[PDB]
């Protein structure tokens, strides 16, 4: 049973899964768009939306909170200065997942794109 349990496991123990989300966040925030598997793409939305939403608040506390996950001061600086301002009037939904047509050859994996919204 899994009744009313939220959150995928992705066959990673607790610290590997956390490092998966952080690493994917750095990549999404760096390039604006990444291709990954559908299940990972779905999980990445909420993780990154929260860091973007903290970047919209702008205060020092939010910057230190975000650094806990992103670590890279220059990346956080881009998130606070360039990324967050274009979402001032957008309330949630800062990321978009769309599914790709071709599966990965070596293992059949369904793939999807994740990206920041305009």
């Amino acid at each position: 049973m899994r009744h009313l349990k939220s959150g995928r496991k992705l066959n990673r123990h607790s610290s590997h899964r956390l490092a998966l989300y952080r690493n994917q966040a750095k990549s999404l925030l760096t390039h604006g768009r990444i291709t990954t598997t559908v299940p990972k793409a779905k999980e990445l939305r909420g993780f990154v939306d929260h860091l973007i939403h903290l970047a919209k608040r702008g205060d020092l506390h939010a910057r230190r909170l975000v650094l806990r996950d992103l670590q890279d001061v220059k990346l956080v600086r881009k998130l606070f200065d360039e990324i967050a301002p274009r979402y001032r009037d957008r309330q949630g939904g800062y990321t978009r997942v769309l599914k790709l047509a071709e599966r990965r050859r070596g293992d059949g994996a369904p793939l999807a794109l994740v990206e920041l919204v305009e």
Binding site: L98, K99, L100, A101, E102
Partner: protein, 59 residues
Amino acid sequence: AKHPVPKKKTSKARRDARRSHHALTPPTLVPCPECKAMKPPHTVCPECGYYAGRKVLEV
């Protein structure tokens, strides 16, 4: 345990009857409204990069 083992060779009939559920189902495909190419529903079109009426990626 004590190494269970098949008691009799499976007949051609019984082998192939077990396989009565093995035929693949064809991939479901819809036309892309932009370039008319066949492609799976709910995916970005791989021939022209359109989805939901706009261009999403370079093809």
